[PDB]
Nucleic acid binder design. Sequence first.
RNA 1: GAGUCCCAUAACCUUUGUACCCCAGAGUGAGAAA
RNA 2: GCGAUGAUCACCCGGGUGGGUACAAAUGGCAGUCUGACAAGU
Lengths: 385, 121, 54, 255, 241
Amino acid sequence: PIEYLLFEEPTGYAVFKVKLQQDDIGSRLKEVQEQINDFGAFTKLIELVSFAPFKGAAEALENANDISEGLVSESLKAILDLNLPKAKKNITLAISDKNLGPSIKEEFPYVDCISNELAQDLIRGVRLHGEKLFKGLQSGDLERAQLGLGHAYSRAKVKFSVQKNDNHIIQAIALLDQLDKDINTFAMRVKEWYGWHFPELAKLVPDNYTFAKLVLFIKDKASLNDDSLHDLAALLNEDSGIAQRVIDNARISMGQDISETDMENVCVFAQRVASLADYRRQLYDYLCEKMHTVAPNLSELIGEVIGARLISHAGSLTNLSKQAASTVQILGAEKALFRKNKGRISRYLANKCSMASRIDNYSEEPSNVFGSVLKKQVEQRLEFY
Amino acid sequence: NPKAFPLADAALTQQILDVVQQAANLRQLKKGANEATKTLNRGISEFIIMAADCEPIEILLHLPLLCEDKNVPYVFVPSRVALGRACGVSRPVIAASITTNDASAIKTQIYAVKDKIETLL
Amino acid sequence: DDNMRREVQRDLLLIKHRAALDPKRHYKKQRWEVPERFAIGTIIEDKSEFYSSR
Amino acid sequence: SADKVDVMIIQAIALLDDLDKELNTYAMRCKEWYGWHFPELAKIVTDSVAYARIILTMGIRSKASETDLSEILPEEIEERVKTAAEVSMGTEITQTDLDNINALAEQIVEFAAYREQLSNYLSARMKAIAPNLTQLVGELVGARLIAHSGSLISLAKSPASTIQILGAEKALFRALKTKHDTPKYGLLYHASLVGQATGKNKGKIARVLAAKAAVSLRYDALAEDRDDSGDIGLESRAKVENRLSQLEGRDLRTT
Amino acid sequence: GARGGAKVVIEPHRHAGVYIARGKEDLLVTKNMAPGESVYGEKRISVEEPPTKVEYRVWNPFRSKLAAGIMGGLDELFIAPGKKVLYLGAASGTSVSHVSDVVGPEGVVYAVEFSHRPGRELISMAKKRPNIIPIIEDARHPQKYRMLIGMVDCVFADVAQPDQARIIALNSHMFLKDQGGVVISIKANCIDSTVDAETVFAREVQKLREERIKPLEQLTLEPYERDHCIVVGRYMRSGLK
RNA sequence: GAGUCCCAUAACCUUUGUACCCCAGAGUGAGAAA
RNA sequence: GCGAUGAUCACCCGGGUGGGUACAAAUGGCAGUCUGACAAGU
């Protein structure tokens, strides 16, 4: 007595019409089970009459939760209303879920829901062939929508959030040290290139970042004016006296003058080193802020940079928390993060560090109150030994 | 809802602690969160007892994640000072573990309480 | 590759006869004819295993 | 003359190889870090510079609906990233995060912008210090040959055979000691002419091209009054092409 | 034994998608989908291939029951490359991540878990592995997540509940294909602690036959686990005779 | 005539410079001080 | 005015040698730049 079948698909809802009804008494016979697998026989049983795709991803999740609780979304109300004929005698609808049945009946008094094994068997067929039954109707791809909906449905129940997230910390550290290496490497090259044109400056201004900025100014050593002397004197300070030495030594040096095109790169290349240092300063401050937000307790106890390195070593804040006190100590024992009486404080700090991580990881909005008192406790231990 | 969950009642807590004190006498009790973390890792823990009044609780909330993943029962007792007294040590204890031993003289009592915690969870 | 670098060849010959390397090991019985597809790899320890297994 | 120092060549090529590595790691870092927000991009768009430009045009998946990416990506690829945007698995990110990831992206395009500038500069230098060599082997391979020897003069004092196999000492010097056959391409394998050849002709062209390379190279290094025209290379290039056409024209199979 | 820098010979296992790393000791290893990281701190093997650096993960039998099944010599596993697998009782990525490795990028895994504390970790691992669909929902009610699961070539159930026989049946009826695989891990203490282990295994097998699952094989997991057995069966809707 | 394709753009060893170490590791688990 | 939120657990004359861990450099070592007259067509 089944006449219509309702199927819920991540793309949308599909309604079918059952042309022929399969044998009830022989339902367990091998033959009636085999026809479910064969597509040639199955098409004779059911046909697609309607398909209403969801408007968007957000709609799919709303119906995914509504279907989970056995509630009838506005979309499902529409498709059934459009299809099911008005009906002494009631149109029969096959649904997978028994919990969904009463909800449909309240909305539509004239439809009877069936979810017995006969209905379950047809649903098994529809799920089995999937897009093949849609006769080319646009269901997108049933697998990609399934994947996207699954993460959406799951995280909604768990209440996953970005505030808890600490992967941002891990990425910044791997980038911060990489910036530090690259700034040094290129800054070294800037010294060599401008070293050829005027080697004595690389001795005068050892600080590379100072050297790069000064090279942007004194492109050609031949240019020497008292006004320029003041301008380069403004760069850094004359306490070292480099302002006077460069003016004097530029007048008198063995530096070999290089081409304008090569000069053009020393300033351009020095500019790139300047930008990276500017970016590295920005990224370091971003890391500092994020630790205070993510792991205020760990960051306050040891420091923003050190704690982030400890988090990266464990691979995640959660991994750090689950570890025992002994394991955390050897976690930073390769870079001496925590460093006989010297060893005792290292071990003592390790236990407190492990305690700090637990508070950060399992609190939705960690505060820094416990981290400070934890640190003062270490300070008293520090004074004692 | 509360982070410390589930919390054993007065009737159960006295039964739990009575097992704790005997396990201490038989050298089958591990005391402290760090010890309890090791036992779960080694898979030698019968079940974990925790203190619900730990200040803050968060310093022992890594155990439930370990306890469930290994399918080891766990329970909260209201008092840490009382739990420490049961353990046989002179300081409060926030977490304890009952080591696994099928040859223990107190096997039946451990299994009796272990059933109650499973139902309570 | 058909080159069959002698360093690789000696490695596999040192695994066919691994029972005699150490007098306290005494592995199971097996033949291990050289497979036609294999690769050589280096283990990477966990950072937590710095003292134990590194 | 300031325009005839080879030490700029050896540093320029050394810097270029360093840049190709660092630009790669930064491109990689952006792919995981921004891929957190939207992991499906890396599979769709593979080019690093293109990937960075997507972040620049649209900061967040929400912008994918209205933001137009046509200049970066073709039509069929560009709609894919729109479809992935609505169904994606990634987490939303704060503006503080976006500014930092956005800053990293600008470094990617900036380095690519500067990398091509360095390549052009090396081309100008190679065309001014050894113009004949560039006409024959090419600027990029030409620079590496100079850098391997350490100086233009030292390469000039090397015979043609060494220049053929300059970049394959390990294979060569392994082969000599063990009484096996020796390599035949070395560093010149990336020369344009050798690429045009096929089969065993690659080895023959490598021999012919290397011999002419030494002639064009020696005229570059030891000529007191060299004109920056490359005429010796250009006529040398014609001979190699003629040898190539005749060498390729022959067919082993019987007709 | 298997220290850091030691070199090993990687060769294929009899089961597709599983590899053996020989040496002084033998290790069961699966190819890593997300190279460069370990999900539960296992040892990893790095191989240079033309050159790209592939990475392998060590499979620890004492942590994953399925791995203990391989070591004891299960004849048939329906988990193979390019097959959809429904993993019930996915506490975390300890064993699902390895199952995700075997199926390959082409296959998929639907990880089903109930408790939320491990679920958050299951989602986190899932993002690194695109072919894992995490379902944080009770496996006793397969209908709640029917939208999220298509047909699955095999069903693997590690759920530790007394009524697991009902869980396996309901999920198999909805999602498992005809002639599809069923693999179940049974812990006798969990089902019935009063009676001995063998009766529970004998009792549990009977329920599967009632539920139209033909048991092909049972294996005990000692010495890795005590009181455990893995039963591999085929879902024969047509007839078990 | 002749192995680019086991990164000579490299690996390994030695020397120097810098910064740390001379305790156990799945570390142990109820003592310490008087 | 303690503690399971964790107690306890190489050499030589204040100075110098020995050994270990991370990085950088070396115009320091391994370390030595292939053969040499034929070939292709009718």
